[PDB]
Amino acid sequence: DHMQTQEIISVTLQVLSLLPPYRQSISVLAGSTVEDVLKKAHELGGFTYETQASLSGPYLTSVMGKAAGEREFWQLLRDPNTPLLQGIADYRPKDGETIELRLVSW
Ligand code: B12
Ligand SMILES: C#Cc1ccc(F)cc1F
Ligand SMILES: [Ca+2]
Numbered sequence: 001d002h003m004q005t006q007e008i009i010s011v012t013l014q015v016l017s018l019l020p021p022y023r024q025s026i027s028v029l030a031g032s033t034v035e036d037v038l039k040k041a042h043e044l045g046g047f048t049y050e051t052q053a054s055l056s057g058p059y060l061t062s063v064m065g066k067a068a069g070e071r072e073f074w075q076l077l078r079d080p081n082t083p084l085l086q087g088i089a090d091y092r093p094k095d096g097e098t099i100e101l102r103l104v105s106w
Contacts, residue, residue: 006030009095011037013047017103018064022047034076034099035088049101057089063101075104 007030015022026041035058041047050062060074061067068074076084076091077100084091093099 006095009093011093011095012098013037013041013101014098015063015101017101018066022064030095031092033089034084034091034093037093037099038088051088057087060088060101063103066103068103072103072105075102076100077102 008027009030009032010025010027011032012023012025014024024041024044024047026037026044028036028040032040035051038047038049038060042049048064049060050067051058052061053059060076063074076088078084078093079098
């Protein structure tokens with residue numbers, strides 16, 4: 001009886017680089033980008049983030065109040081432990097995906 005035609009999908013968003021960690025299932029419209037997931041998570045309450053505009057599209061600079069500093073970046077991953085090959089405005093997760101934001105240093 002539930003919708004199985006995927007007009008609405010659900011994507012788990014997780015951030016484990018912070019204490020306390022964040023993990024929530026976020027429902028969004030089909031075809032949503034990662035950025036749409038971040039927007040929804042913020043709208044629902046209990047999540048925040050910031051981006052910076054660029055010629056390559058929005059770049060994720062801060063997650064849950066923690067801004068990336070020198071030689072750090074917020075990395076985007078899908079299951080299993082696989083970094084995305086597109087940014088937040090271009091990657092469109094599949095229904096049931098888990099997107100992780102991970103603070104990585106080089
Ligand atoms: C080095 C690099 C990075 C470095 C940049 C550090 C630095 N240089 O100071 C770091 C590690 C931070 C990085 C991160 C990411 N990046 Co990168 N990166 C590169 C790379 C290999 C070279 C860029 C460069 O030095 N260009 C030369 C300088 C002179 O030109 P520039 O225009 O000023 O370059 C800047 C931008 O490229 C920006 N940048 C780098 N990556 C990304 C990704 C996105 C989405 C944006 C908006 C900007 C951006 O940082 C550069 C320095 O300021 C390119 C491949 C390429 N195109 O060259 C990718 C590339 C741009 N990155 C890419 C990706 C996917 C990512 C990540 C999403 C990976 C991830 N899974 O987390 C993240 C960004 C997530 C976020 N927080 O928004 C993709 C983008 C494809 C797309 N547009 O959808 C590219 C094209 C590689 C690829 N083909 O897979 N990246
Ligand atoms: C960005 C970026 C990036 C990170 C790791 C890698 F093996 C290739 C890349 F373009
Ligand atoms: Ca059903």
